[PDB]
Amino acid sequence: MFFQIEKVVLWSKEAKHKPRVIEFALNKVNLITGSSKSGKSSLIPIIDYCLGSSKCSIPVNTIRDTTAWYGVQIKTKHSRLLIARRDPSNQLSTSNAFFVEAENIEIPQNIEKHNVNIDTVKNRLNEISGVSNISFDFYDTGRIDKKRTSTRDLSAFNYQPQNIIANPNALFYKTDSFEHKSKLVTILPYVLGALSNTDIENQHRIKNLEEEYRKVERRLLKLKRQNEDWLSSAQAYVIKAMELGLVNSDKDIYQLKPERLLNVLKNITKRSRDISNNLAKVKSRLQNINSMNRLANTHSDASRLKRERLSLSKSEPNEIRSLVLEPLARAFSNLEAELEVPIHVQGALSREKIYLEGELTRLASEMKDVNTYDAFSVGKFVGEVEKALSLMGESESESELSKEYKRLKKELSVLRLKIDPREFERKTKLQLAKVNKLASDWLPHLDTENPNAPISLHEKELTITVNEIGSGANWLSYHVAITLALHQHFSSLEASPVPNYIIYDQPSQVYFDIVQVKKIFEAFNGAIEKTKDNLQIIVLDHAPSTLVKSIPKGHLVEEWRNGIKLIPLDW
Amino acid sequence: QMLKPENNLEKEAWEINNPAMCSYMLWIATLAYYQKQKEPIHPSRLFCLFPFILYSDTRNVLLSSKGSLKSYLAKFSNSKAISGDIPLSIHFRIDIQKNKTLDALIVAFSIKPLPNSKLTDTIKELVYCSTKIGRWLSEMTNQDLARDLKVIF
Amino acid sequence: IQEYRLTQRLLEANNSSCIGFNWMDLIDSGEIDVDNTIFLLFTNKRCHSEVLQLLSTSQCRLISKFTYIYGSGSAPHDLRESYKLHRLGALEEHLDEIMYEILGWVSDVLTLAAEKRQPTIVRAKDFGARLGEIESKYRQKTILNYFCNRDAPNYIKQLNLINVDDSELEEAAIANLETKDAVVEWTLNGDVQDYSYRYYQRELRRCWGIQKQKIHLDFNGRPETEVGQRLYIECLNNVTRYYLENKKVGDFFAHGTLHSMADKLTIGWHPEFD
Amino acid sequence: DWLSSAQAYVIKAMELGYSTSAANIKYASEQEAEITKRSRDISNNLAKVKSRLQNINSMNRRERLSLSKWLLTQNDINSNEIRSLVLEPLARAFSNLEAELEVPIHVQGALSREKIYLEGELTRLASEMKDVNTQLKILRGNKRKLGYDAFSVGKFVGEVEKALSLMG
DNA sequence: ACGTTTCTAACTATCA
DNA sequence: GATAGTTAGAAACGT
Lengths: 571, 153, 274, 168
What we know:
Order of helices and strands of chain B: HHHHHH
Order of helices and strands of chain C: HHHHHHHHHH
Structural class of chain C: mainly alpha
Number of strands of chain B: 0
Shape of chain C: elongated
Helix content of chain B: 25-40%
Distance between the termini of chain B: 26 Å
Strand content of chain C: under 5%
Largest sheet of chain B: none
Oligomer: heterotetramer
Structural class of chain B: mainly alpha
Number of strands of chain C: 0
Number of helices of chain B: 6
Distance between the termini of chain C: 45 Å
Number of domains of chain C: 2
């Protein structure tokens, strides 16, 4: 997004004055001229520690001895923000933040304790940045390589300290061995423009639809594709209905349609019946008697808790009290009748049933004794016909089941085919080719062994892959070319989550030859106006202040804001 | 104008009480507002912000409170809860006001708050939650109110 | 006379066959007897020309189970005191009714034994079964007016107009309060909007109003109240599919909502004026 | 799930029988009550999850809330003093938040983890709803299936063989 | 790159 | 205004 540093604060331990502001001009190339050991190279860990760093790389015995609060101010696309952070001191690196936000930012004095945690600052930066909240884990392994991407994770390609500018091994900020290389190979297609917030939700929505597919296709459509043997026996077991014949059975199998045959299929010993009247419409309503006692016992226990959970009933209108307050005040006085349960409920649950177990199971044993077509034949046939008809398309193209297969399961292939991994690879290769063809424009603006060889990168390692031999300060030229290429690509994009500032720290650390750094500042001059003034460059060097005066995009803040050192000795 | 349609009630669905639960969101979202940082917001300004004292998934993460509203909304948006969309329901839960905000404020229009000893396990919890809410809105501006609550009023 | 006190000896029994019962006492084991077999419980006067004090309750055959009431004190207050004491509980002020339908049982068996001159063997097990059925009925109706009254509600009085069963009155009383509890619990969490109930129960005229007129034009041989019989059983099957409460709700809902209409003035399952 | 869809006949078989038992009827009523309370819990959670999905995902196609000029929209939802003394200052103070700044706030703050978790919750709660609805349908019958005689036990074992001979 | 286990610190209720 | 007390904050392992 638009996210540019305006000014950097360094609060003292409340001696007299001087919160030590280090300002930066917006959308320019910012330079301060340095002495030998003024300590200006440690401003990058100060700003990174203010941004939400877990550790603190602010150096010991020079800066941390006389500083209480560290703050930076970064202007957003809308309004600004100031992120302060106190000194870690004894508790390793675990201070918390002071995070104010307004349209304009004013620096107060020391603000004693903190008010906002550092994960709060990280979450606010993420919701400003527009990064996806997804965990990036398309197999859901709980990985840190595939995790939620933060603006703290986007602090790479934003700071170029002393140790990595003249180093081809480490390309960006704090990604030397494995601290951010995994969470940059995870997020490079997302920041190059291949993916978006709506695009990143597809790779787990398709897994949810795959789970729904495995739910529906586990049966493999028993009602549709695995019922041919039932239709083979649909015209075969009707000869058993002739044997157990009460209704008019089938006249002839090979005389009717199968639909007509299914429509046909739709349709001393009396002591068992003379016992069975107390088990059909007496024991069934006795199970319902158990539903009077036990269900209402647990309901009166539950509505006791529901009324206990209603422990909360306790302009000049005229009906706002008698009909709106007074029913609630009345219902507060009616809660006391709900904690009481009558003793007859559990009495009928336990004791009345224990007197009745011999009153109902005795006739059940009598029915068993006198139970030694058939009695269960019309039970086993009528009712199984109903279950067979309710198993074959009672709701298949009408309400649910196979109706959703023509709707939901025709969207799984739609979601799989509208954005495949082939489209992701093609878009990330197009964006990588765009950032490579945009990269070589500063090769005439800079100087290398070859100012026309097309430089390139790859996602899988994030290193310098030009087409080495005769290297040195050429690593700095490749570094500024690749950083300006990536930041110009992010500025030319829409909804890019990356802050558009690059901080450079000692380009002339290999040299100390002013023509090379002059052409470096010429490239920095050019790169601001390619996207029509959406980029910031901060340079920290001992180069003289005259290298920006003949440059339209170049700014000095009069050394260390008219100072001699970063830390003033007059604190 | 009265707030219940007389005897033509669908059911007694007002477990959230319009004149008994909340007045200015239990009336102590303006007493804590006066307590922390004195800004009036009484004659015309808007209390129709945070009826998450009236939601039993957000009132629970408001008992465990930090000391800033942004920290609470950040505690909404980590992997402990797998959430973050429900902060954006400040935008959504004031259109029709299913939480009955702007209806449960007519009854409101400085005596002491009722002490925490008379607990009742829900009323004092909501009182603590709404005092946290009321003291948390006094540290923000209107642009901050549209910013971190994610609303366009 | 005897009916007001015959149940008293039956309460102190355990399938003991308390017999209720000159012109008698020649029956030497006419029917099948039991070990206790409380015999000869029939006196109504003092001594006369026939000496009834020949054994004077010494306690036909060798060992006598003769026991008679002295003084002919029919219908006493200690008949009621034998129920509060001895066995069983109950005592929820509907005990005069339990007595009134337990003197009817011994009155009915004494009327059955008035004609058909065989002995008057009274089962104590059947007395216990009848007393248990009466106790179950009165415990069931004292379960009611607690889960219904917050006398009788306005959705149960109209459900007794068609009066399908008592289990439907149970399901109405369970479902109305369970629906109220779920609405209270939803309002506790803010899950369901307050205006969603007007979008769910005022649109049940797609059942009460188009199926109130469906079977009335289909069935015309139903004189007074059977035309509202199957309307209830069709509403109870055609309302558990409605997706107007945002997401579809459980089967316990829209049954107690139909019962929640009839607590106030509404149209309902009754085909009459109320 | 086939195990949750066939939780009945592991309770209803000894509810029916063969010989009945009042303790078995009590146990089957207890298990049916547990299944119904699980159905209520799944109903509540599914309704909440789908309500949040239908609420939050409306901005995929944010929006201006437009609580200004709501003396004509929210004036008649209540059953004049609400308007003229409370909402009339609020009519002139609801537009003092959107129109006070020139540029409205665009789409900021992703919902991707929330959308994915809510859709997975929708799938799981719909599956559990289908399982417990089949459980209640088998345990409760259509309208008249409760019977321990020679007819309804045969109907239940016919339904058991029809729902077990194919669905494994 | 922060969540996920244990630990201490602190300020603020809850009673001084 | 004091003992608890709950929640906020600290350090290493995950990968």
